[PDB]
């Protein structure tokens, strides 16, 4: 004979001894959001990972403006950036930033960095936006810190309206133009 | 007949052919910390997510002080903030900050942002604390960056002492009061 | 009789009714990257967590230089730092920083903080590096914010070359030496 009860746990696994009497069915195992069940003949492997993630390198040779105009923030067009790494189809680069797909509402860990050695004065202004809410931070320059960083953990509500479900990005120096810059933008959905 | 051996893997799944001889039991499948096993009749679905997370919007209309006093940091009372999103019961808002429950020791990804357009001068002082350790960062203002941000990935040891197992929060401008501000505080336990 | 079909899902679980005819084998369940299948007799528990993580406290009594020289960044030797918390063997402290092991390429959530109360002037310069890419940020001081923070979410490509697969760290004040400092460095691989 077969089957056992436990208390905690679920699906019995081989439940469904009922719906086709005389027949013990034994349910299969699927991996939902953030999981992978790989079928190695010997046993099924439950592996975890994030649903979506996109990491871009943005320079004047990977979709960037020849010169980031001094003291001013114009949202970046990242349709041409360079995809260093990505996971899933939830996060995609577009001309307005990184677009989030339908049903992708959740928490996102975002980081945008910059490095433009030739400009070590003034402050580096950074800005990530999403919907009505926009996040900022100014980073004082110097030859030792000729750049800036803005990391964020935010909740993104995805309406399902393609042009509002987008993370827009932007940065610059308040007293000089950037045309020798290396930018990095990484977005990851953790839940 | 039934059952097979594998090498790697575990529980045999239908192990426990021993403890009730003549009876093949076949163990069930439970989802521990950060997992969800949903019972779709056809098969059990293993889904992943974080254990706990809390995301607050904090303004002068969601539990905030009518005016954040200039140059000075007084821990925020977030009992009245607004819960934009939350996951689990581990992270709860209180009058001293975000409280962590018993047995919730682990790594936390924290982000507190501010935006107060009407004040574009001086620096924005931000501060997150936990126990003896406190983390800070000053953010130079400007009309383009009229705010500040502080993101953190820290290890929180939860003693189980309700008044010490709390993330306290605080920010301000070093040269003006904030009374037209929008604050956001998100905490997430990733392990 | 036994077994059932589902559509979605996998491994049938008790598949392999073929490879040893007349014998229903019933595969086992293993936990891959970021998962733990614990064998409680009653049922197997699928638990999730991160693969690797390391959290260090760095002071002049846990492998640190008696004095962090003013205005200048020298990569920190963290072989002697203090391991507040760690998860897995992927992230290990060394004399050049935190080393990543073979096959550990992936996204990393990094945070380095500093606090040196006795020095409240000038800016705190912070710097995390990895390969050719280096990330920076300057944090204006003050008695209220006598420190700095740099949080990052980056993609680390691990070549498998032990001396290049290392996160180097470094910080200081641009106008004074730090010899009463408390530093914290936490690295976590989330995918």
Whether B167 and B96 have beta carbons less than 8 Å apart is answered as: no
CB pairs under 8 A between A and C: 189
Whether A163 and A52 have beta carbons less than 8 Å apart is answered as: no
**Could you give the CA distance from residue A40 to residue A36 in angstroms, rounded to a whole number?**
12
How far apart are the CA of A173 and the nearest CA of chain C, in angstroms? 13
Q: What is the rounded (10 degree) CA torsion for C124, C125, C129, C135?
A: 100
**Could you give the CA distance from residue A135 to residue B186 in angstroms, rounded to a whole number?**
13
Q: What is the rounded (10 degree) CA torsion for C62, C66, C72, C78?
A: -20
Contacts of C23 in chain B (CB under 8 A): 1-2, 4
For residue C32, give the chain A residue with the closest CA.
Answer: A47
Residues 6+ apart with CB under 8 A from B91: B52, B53, B54, B98, B99, B100, B187, B188, B189
Best residue in A38, A73, A138, A170 for a mutation probing chain B (most B CBs within 10 Å): A138
Instruction: Sort strands B166-173 and B123-130 into parallel, antiparallel or unpaired.
Output: antiparallel
Considering CB atoms only, which of B2, B28, B155 is closest to C85? B155
How far apart are the CA of C163 and the nearest CA of chain B, in angstroms? 25
C18 and B CB contact within 8 Å: no
Whether A81 and A62 have beta carbons less than 8 Å apart is answered as: yes
Count of C-beta atoms within a 10 Å radius of residue B115: 21
Handedness of CA B68, C143, C59, C132 (dihedral sign): positive
**Could you give the CA distance from residue B150 to residue B71 in angstroms, rounded to a whole number?**
17
Considering CB atoms only, which of A9, A22, A44 is closest to C11? A44
Best residue in C51, C145, C146, C187 for a mutation probing chain B (most B CBs within 10 Å): C145
C-alpha distances in angstroms, C52 versus A67, B135, C189? 39, 23, 6
**Could you give the CA distance from residue C168 to residue A22 in angstroms, rounded to a whole number?**
64
Rg, Å, chain C Cα set = 23
A88 and C CB contact within 8 Å: no
Domains of chain B: 34-191 (2.60.120.670)
DSSP state of C116: -
Considering CB atoms only, which of B4, B73, B153 is closest to C144? B73
Nearest to A80 by CA among A63, A67, A102, A94: A63
Whether C44 and C29 have beta carbons less than 8 Å apart is answered as: yes
Q: What is the rounded (10 degree) CA torsion for C171, C176, C180, C184?
A: -10
Whether C165 and C158 have beta carbons less than 8 Å apart is answered as: yes
Q: Answer whether B31 sits within 8 Å of C45, measured CB to CB.
A: yes
**Could you give the CA distance from residue C102 to residue C112 in angstroms, rounded to a whole number?**
24
C42 and A CB contact within 8 Å: yes
Rg, Å, chain A Cα set = 23
C-alpha distances in angstroms, C131 versus B63, C99, C160, C161, C169? 45, 12, 12, 11, 12
CA angle A116, B135, B176 (to 5 degrees): 80
B4 and A CB contact within 8 Å: yes
Query: Which residues does residue B173 pair with via DSSP β-bridges, in sequence order?
Result: B124, B176
Whether B87 and A153 have beta carbons less than 8 Å apart is answered as: no
For residue A34, give the chain B residue with the closest CA.
Answer: B48
Rg, Å, chain B Cα set = 23
Best residue in C5, C28, C110, C171 for a mutation probing chain B (most B CBs within 10 Å): C28
- Structure determined by: X-ray
Whether A186 and C155 have beta carbons less than 8 Å apart is answered as: yes
CA angle B113, A65, A133 (to 5 degrees): 20
Whether A115 and A181 have beta carbons less than 8 Å apart is answered as: yes
CB pairs under 8 A between B and C: 189
Listing DSSP states for C14-26 in one string gives T--SSSSTT-B--
For residue C181, give the chain B residue with the closest CA.
Answer: B133
Furthest CA-CA distance within chain B? 79
**Could you give the CA distance from residue B154 to residue B133 in angstroms, rounded to a whole number?**
10
**Could you give the CA distance from residue C185 to residue C57 in angstroms, rounded to a whole number?**
7
**3-state DSSP helix/strand/coil percent for chain B, to nearest 5?**
0, 50, 50
Q: What is the SS3 string spanning chain A?
A: CECCCCCCCECCCCCCCCCCCCCECCCEEEECCCEEEEEECCEEEEEECCCEEEEEEEECCCCCCCCECCCCCCCCCCCCCEEEEEECCCEEEECCEEEECCCCCEEEEEEEEEECCCCCCCEEEEEEEECCEEEEEEEECCCCCCEEEEEEEEEECCCCCCCCCEEEEEEEECCECECCCEEEEEEEECC
DSSP strand E in chain C: where? 28-31, 35-40, 43-48, 52-59, 82-87, 91-94, 97-100, 106-115, 123-130, 133-140, 147-156, 166-173, 182-189
Contacts of A74 in chain B (CB under 8 A): none
CA C147 to chain centre: 22
B47 and A CB contact within 8 Å: yes
Nearest to B124 by CA among B114, B132, B133: B114
Count of C-beta atoms within a 10 Å radius of residue A111: 25
**Could you give the CA distance from residue B183 to residue B3 in angstroms, rounded to a whole number?**
57
Whether A37 and A173 have beta carbons less than 8 Å apart is answered as: no
For residue A47, give the chain C residue with the closest CA.
Answer: C32
Query: Which residues does residue C110 pair with via DSSP β-bridges, in sequence order?
Result: C152, C187
Considering CB atoms only, which of C113, C115, C145 is closest to B125? C145
């Amino acid at each position: 004979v077969v089957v056992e009860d436990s208390g905690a746990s679920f699906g019995e696994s081989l439940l469904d001894t009922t719906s086709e009497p005389g027949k013990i069915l034994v349910k299969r195992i699927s991996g939902g959001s953030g999981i992978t069940v790989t079928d190695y003949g010997d046993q099924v492997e439950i592996e975890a990972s994030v649903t979506d993630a996109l990491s871009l390198m943005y320079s004047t040779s990977t979709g960037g403006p020849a010169s980031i105009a001094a003291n001013a923030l114009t949202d970046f067009d990242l349709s041409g950036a360079l995809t260093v790494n990505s996971v899933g189809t939830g996060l995609t680069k577009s001309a307005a930033g990184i677009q989030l797909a339908a049903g992708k509402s959740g928490l996102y860990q975002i980081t945008m960095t910059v490095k433009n050695n030739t400009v070590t004065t003034g402050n580096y202004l950074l800005r990530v936006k999403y919907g009505s809410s926009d996040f900022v931070v100014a980073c004082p320059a110097s030859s030792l810190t000729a750049g800036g960083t803005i990391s964020l953990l935010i909740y993104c509500n995805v309406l399902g309206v393609v042009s509002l479900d987008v993370l827009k990005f932007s940065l610059c120096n308040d007293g000089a133009a950037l045309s020798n810059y290396i930018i990095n933008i990484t977005a990851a959905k953790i839940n």
